[PDB]
Ligand binder design. Sequence first.
Ligand SMILES: C[C@H](NC(=O)CCc1nc2ccccc2c(=O)[nH]1)c1ccncc1
Length: 354
Amino acid sequence: SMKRVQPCSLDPATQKLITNIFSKEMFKNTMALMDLDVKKMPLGKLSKQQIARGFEALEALEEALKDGGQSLEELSSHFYTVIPHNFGHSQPPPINSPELLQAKKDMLLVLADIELAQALQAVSEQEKTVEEVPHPLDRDYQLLKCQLQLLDSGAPEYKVIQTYLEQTGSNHRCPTLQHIWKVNQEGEEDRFQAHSKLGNRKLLWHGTNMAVVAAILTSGLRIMPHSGGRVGKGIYFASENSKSAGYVIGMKCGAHHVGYMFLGEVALGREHHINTDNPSLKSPPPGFDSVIARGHTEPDPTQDTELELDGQQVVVPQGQPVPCPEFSSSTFSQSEYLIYQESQCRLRYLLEVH
Ligand SMILES: C[C@H](NC(=O)CCc1nc2ccccc2c(=O)[nH]1)c1ccncc1
């Protein structure tokens, strides 16, 4: 017997978000942008086991990069058998540098979040038995187990957020704000409440691939094995939208280029400032709660405002970037804010930008 499809409860902006973040085209586009062979690795055939074997192949590579073992070519060949790549049916390149090794680790981290979105969408057994089903976009929204509320022009934080975006985004081609959603991923709450005595909270940008937005909404921002960067194995944020916007992988839709950026409330506590790269960091030093790789510039601190979120004051920058003479010789043009516990960040807002 035919099941009834119930009417969609979502507003238009939210329907479009949910369509974009679960789009098979979007996922396959992302895979093509990462040089993956989507014909040999279709979305539905992606598996946790395959991804795990990929990381094992890169771990073997890493060890070889640091005795009569297998050549980098032989070990690369093994990786590429596990994770098929496409380079116009030429040979794929040997993974023979720290930079390329990490680029492959980053590709697998994105692919793991694509696989997470696919597994999330699997039809449960209850759903096969119930006689009415939600509209597909309500179903997909519900799988996130994450409350999203579209804001309008006169939500109390709307102009504050807009100002943060405009004042710290690129001067010439600033991203155009389309929508803001407030994000409440429940049961971030409990772990985040742990740090309630920790002051020094700031609302910070996290730009991302469209392909990992569903994963982030479901699971929060995470520190994954194999993740890394100029400040080590943590979660990375920026006070300058323009820094985070560089990590936005958008998608062409009609005449526009659509992307997503998060704002997270980050309990930074006592900050350790650095001015040179340290990719080997796994934690702040003792008695510190965060590491800030300090940039040549910072949003003018004299213009900081605050929002009140769950009864805590959260600093929100509102100033254009100004020079910080004390970090004029830093290896970082713009600051990178690092935490090394997933509990120190709570997702607060999601922005669609064109
Ligand atoms: C490989 C990919 N990387 C990113 O999403 C990086 C995002 C990002 N990095 C930053 C680094 C410094 C300052 C700001 C940012 C930022 O806003 N986003 C990824 C990492 C971990 N899980 C899934 C995907």
